[PDB]
């Protein structure tokens, strides 16, 4: 783990981002714990996760035009890592855009997307149904995405029906020939938090990933 | 009047990117207006980081003290993100666990709960007060404090035509809720730094308008 990683994760825990119990999903899965992007919510949180976002984000070369959230939590995504691309970034991200849709009508908050290269900024993948939404939106606005970048990569399949198992970030990566980045995924919280989780969330987790982990 | 260097900064990037322009344009108020304001197309990392700095020191001078800044949807969101960051980012430690808060349009309140939190409300501009006024309502329904607005750009123009006192969109919201209503740069400040660089024409399509709807 490199050390944004670890400070990312030290804060989930801090701000309880990273909590485990029993949750069901929006895929109806019923899973043994949650992230919640979300509480990072302090300016100084915020702070912090954008930074971890574009630290990944310009480690990954990848080039592009615009960065993309999904309404409504994408939004502020999108806002703050745009800043801190131009911020810590240097000259080939100062003028980087950002973009987002509203939910109903005049879609694209922004400059048209139209044949512009397209950052896919979200929270959390599971099933990737979340991000499936935001590529139709973004093709009905005939923008080219160039990637994906969630905060946590859960490393589960899209469905148990694949034999395969991919996960769903495999999947869409293998599917559209784009990366998907993810400043951490679930192997990292398990091994890098593996003290400040007991025993039964471990084996909790373990059979979890029985039914629903990428293989 | 004062011109600090960040406001003149900020309004030389506002004609830069096509945010402040003049020419002819229908207000959603109705009103017929010789230029106009789009704080939306600051869109590039630089630009937002300008305009993140440009809140965050009005903000800063202030001395106001607030639990969330809110941002109505959809544009007022990013606003809300960005400066909740940079105040934590330049503000110091008075400014490190400050939240933010928005709403959805329909099911409301995205972030903590509203409820007995001081609230300042961060919008792009203020012609007659219609955008801030629906936004007290949504944070009155969440039982919210409201003890400050911010705007980039007070417009300075009266909320009606028939009031005979002429008050301004934001004296008029300051006196009903006795609360600071801040902003990056007023039209004057726009006017007197601009100087000779707004056209003749464009001056006295300017002063035509304020005839109308200038605050007293
Ligand atoms: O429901 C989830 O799958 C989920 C798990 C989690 O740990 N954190 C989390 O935020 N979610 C929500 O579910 C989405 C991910 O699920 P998929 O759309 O199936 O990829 C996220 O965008 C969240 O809205
Ligand atoms: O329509 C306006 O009055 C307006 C003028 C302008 O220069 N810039 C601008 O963005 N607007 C839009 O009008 C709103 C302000 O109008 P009021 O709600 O009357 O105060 C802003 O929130 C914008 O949606
Ligand atoms: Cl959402
Ligand atoms: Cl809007």
Same mark, same amino acid.
């Given at each position: 783990?490199?050390?944004?990683?670890?400070?990312?994760?030290?804060?989930?825990?801090? #701000?309880?981002?990273?909590?485990?119990?029993?949750?069901?999903? =929006?895929?109806?899965?019923?899973?043994?714990?949650?992230?919640?992007?979300?509480?990072? &919510?302090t300016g100084k949180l915020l702070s912090n996760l954008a930074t971890a976002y574009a630290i990944a984000?310009?480690?990954?070369?990848?080039?592009?035009?615009?960065?993309?959230?999904?309404?409504? =939590?994408? @939004?502020?995504?999108?806002?703050?890592? #745009?800043?801190?691309?131009?911020?810590?970034?240097?000259?080939?991200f100062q003028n980087i855009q950002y973009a987002f849709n509203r939910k109903e009508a005049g879609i694209?908050?922004?400059?048209?997307?139209? &044949?512009?290269? +397209?950052?896919?900024?979200?929270?959390?993948?599971?099933?990737?149904?979340?991000? &499936?939404?935001?590529?139709?939106? +973004?093709?009905?606005?005939?923008?080219?995405?160039?990637?994906?970048?969630?905060?946590?990569?859960?490393?589960?399949?899209?469905?148990?029906?694949? =034999?395969?198992?991919?996960?769903?970030?495999? /999947?869409?990566?293998?599917?559209?020939?784009?990366?998907?980045?993810?400043?951490?995924?679930?192997?990292?919280? @398990?091994?890098?938090?593996?003290?400040?989780? /007991?025993?039964?969330?471990?084996?909790?987790?373990?059979?979890?990933?029985? /039914?629903?982990?990428?293989?």
């Amino acid at each position: 783990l490199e050390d944004y990683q670890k400070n990312f994760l030290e804060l989930a825990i801090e #701000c309880q981002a990273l909590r485990f119990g029993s949750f069901k999903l =929006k895929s109806g899965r019923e899973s043994p714990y949650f992230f919640n992007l979300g509480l990072f &919510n302090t300016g100084k949180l915020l702070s912090n996760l954008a930074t971890a976002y574009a630290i990944a984000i310009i480690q990954s070369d990848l080039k592009f035009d615009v960065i993309f959230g999904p309404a409504y =939590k994408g @939004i502020p995504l999108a806002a703050i890592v #745009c800043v801190k691309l131009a911020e810590i970034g240097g000259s080939k991200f100062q003028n980087i855009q950002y973009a987002f849709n509203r939910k109903e009508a005049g879609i694209i908050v922004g400059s048209a997307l139209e &044949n512009k290269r +397209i950052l896919i900024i979200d929270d959390v993948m599971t099933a990737g149904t979340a991000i &499936n939404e935001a590529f139709e939106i +973004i093709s009905n606005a005939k923008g080219q995405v160039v990637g994906s970048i969630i905060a946590l990569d859960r490393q589960e399949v899209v469905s148990t029906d694949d =034999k395969e198992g991919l996960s769903a970030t495999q /999947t869409v990566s293998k599917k559209y020939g784009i990366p998907v980045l993810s400043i951490v995924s679930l192997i990292h919280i @398990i091994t890098y938090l593996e003290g400040r989780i /007991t025993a039964e969330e471990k084996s909790k987790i373990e059979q979890y990933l029985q /039914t629903y982990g990428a293989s």
